Design a protein around this nucleic acid. Sequence first.
DNA 1: TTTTTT
Lengths: 463, 39, 107
Amino acid sequence: RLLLSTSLDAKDELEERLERCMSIVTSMTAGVSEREANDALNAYVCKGLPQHEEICLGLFTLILTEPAQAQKCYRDLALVSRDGMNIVLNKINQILMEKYLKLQDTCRTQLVWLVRELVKSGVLGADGVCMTFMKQIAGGDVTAKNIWLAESVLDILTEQREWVLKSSILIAMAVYTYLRLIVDHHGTAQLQALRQKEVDFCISLLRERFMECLMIGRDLVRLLQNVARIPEFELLWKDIIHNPQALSPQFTGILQLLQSRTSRKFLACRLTPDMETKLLFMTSRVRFGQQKRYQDWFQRQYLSTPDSQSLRCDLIRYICGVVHPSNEVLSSDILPRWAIIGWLLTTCTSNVAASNAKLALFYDWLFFSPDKDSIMNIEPAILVMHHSMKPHPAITATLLDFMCRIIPNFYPPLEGHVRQGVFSSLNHIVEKRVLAHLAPLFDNPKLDKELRAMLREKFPEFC
Amino acid sequence: QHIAAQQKAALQHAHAHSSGYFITQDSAFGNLILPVLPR
Amino acid sequence: TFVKDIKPGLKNLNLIFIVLETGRVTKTKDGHEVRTCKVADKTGSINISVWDDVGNLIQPGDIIRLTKGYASVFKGCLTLYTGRGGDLQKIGEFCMVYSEVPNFSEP
DNA sequence: TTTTTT
């Protein structure tokens, strides 16, 4: 059996199919010597494509459900496969993307074993499988099963580093993943030990392959700034800021990193498939005003532990950078992203998380360029501020205050660029009619006069 | 009023619970700390 | 068929709904545990009474397919039940659109 | 193998 099921659960179609394929395989291999068993397999695979798929899927399922038979079934699979195990890797990705949370513990163990084998065999697309595997490591989650997966994948990538170096995308993705996971690993000796392994791994790749990591874009800076106080990263920050060419001759300054947007694949990789499915549903199908139970369900599953705080930032970046609703959803009654953002902000119980969340919300404002960047990345912050003004003025005020203060403080040598970015943001918000007028926001009577003076002093053209 | 003591407390609490880089601000609006690049 | 089409006396009810709430459990008679769950689709909500095991396995957010359900009136309230030859099956979670009102289990 | 159940 592949999946955990209760008497309430409907039968799983995928599990049932794999179980039949396993049945086909043992029907042709049981009660006979391994000569006769291998002959039957090789003879049946010749019948055509679906028979070939049945055998490969059956050996795959044997590997997952029968550890005692696993080594042999893998040898056989490598022999009978006439497509470089392409159909097995597809099913692996499907299982990871759709079934992981229900996947039995022994099957999880076996699947980690199998991936390590596929990597050692240099199977085509094994790097894709590794990236799919990492996506199942949940951020903001230090439970035993999740820690287990984090360390198991790290070990595969560590002992097969030379193989990792063959894939630019895998390098970038593994660094993004573990830079983020490092945040959650503290508070126990086990976690501190894991964190040290993760730090060494990330630094090693960053220093040896900085140009590949640059593919990530500006969110790499956000990840690095969240781990800045770890001594190894404190050292790396000295290089990024004061001696960037030590990392690569083509990296002349952090500005070039800050001025490149992060592509969706990196923002998405830090939501599990389930988190992402639930968030995408809320922002495309749920009507504004009807979002309360969905939020409570989501919160109860992902946002209730003290360790879950770090997840808010991934969610916020995802909402800003990945979820770009079509004009139909925008011009409808569907739950808007600003409302999702507003909710996520109030779930921030600690000052560190709230502070990081604000930076996350504003991150694409800092170096905004209408040619490079999308207005959909900067839209949520200005709409949160606008729509919160009457219901919760404290929200509008803290975000407006944050906005002015981050400008000279984020990175002082680039203050002029950051000001230009926020200005370009506000201006583009106006000229694309997201918010037609800034004066009713910036000079609202409800705002503290001190804050209103700050705004008028810093942004005269909008008051 | 005790703005400087509140700033230092907030920064010390952040350092105990986070690896991020923060600086203090005399914010009246819940921005006693700001996450910024290392200095 | 939808939640709004449910009338007392109807049987062979096949429908899909999402679970909103699961009320408190009651004991008795034969040590049987029963709880009322609030379930809904886009037309509105209704109470379903669930016995014993499924009762303990059911969670708010569960998308559930009922086959061969029936409806009757219990304590003044139109109530959904699992009938003979039927069952409750969870086919998913979270991702269903529903309306909380009208509540068809109102007196 | 509940089940026009309590």
